[PDB]
User: Fold Green Fluorescent Protein from Aequorea victoria.
Amino acid sequence: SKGEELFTGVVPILVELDGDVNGHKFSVSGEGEGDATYGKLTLKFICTTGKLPVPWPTLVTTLVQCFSRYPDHMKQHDFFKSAMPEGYVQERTISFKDDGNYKTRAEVKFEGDTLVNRIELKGIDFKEDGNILGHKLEYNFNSGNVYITADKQKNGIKANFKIRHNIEDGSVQLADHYQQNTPIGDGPVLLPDNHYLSTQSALSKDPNEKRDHMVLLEFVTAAGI
Ligand SMILES: [Mg+2]
Assistant:
């Protein structure tokens, strides 16, 4: 597609999130770059409002699947880049087992030559000392797959996947993800066959950073065709 041409090099990324979880208001700003040729993302996120009131790993999936590496033989299945530069809306319900849920709405689009992800996040029905508001999740993030299917009536895609957040005691907090994406623009997009994205993510800290923050390195590769 026309859009995939925008991703042949390194692309600067901006992420901006506004959040309310159980009435705890917070904002996150991220900066970095994506190189879809290698499925590679490098980003640093900062909580600009103070302490983040939820664990950082629980925001990883919310905080740009257009940077996935689609192998040449599957390029006709890359919805995400096909919607660019006008972009797409990405909506999710993330259901934390035995706890609350996030509902998210994001717009992913180019602003000049920069890929922007703008997100509103609302979290409700969280337990005051559950694994999320009680900060009982380890600072890491497991490898996993994101299963994509076409949504022809919405000219878009859906995804379903199960994130497993490691709890500090050796157990797991499941976060069921249901996702829908729809184009913003009126140009044609690629509606894919069933496939998945395979992810790997490394979380770290900037030793010189005193603000609450997350350094993220992620690799994502499309597969399943
Ligand atoms: Mg462990």
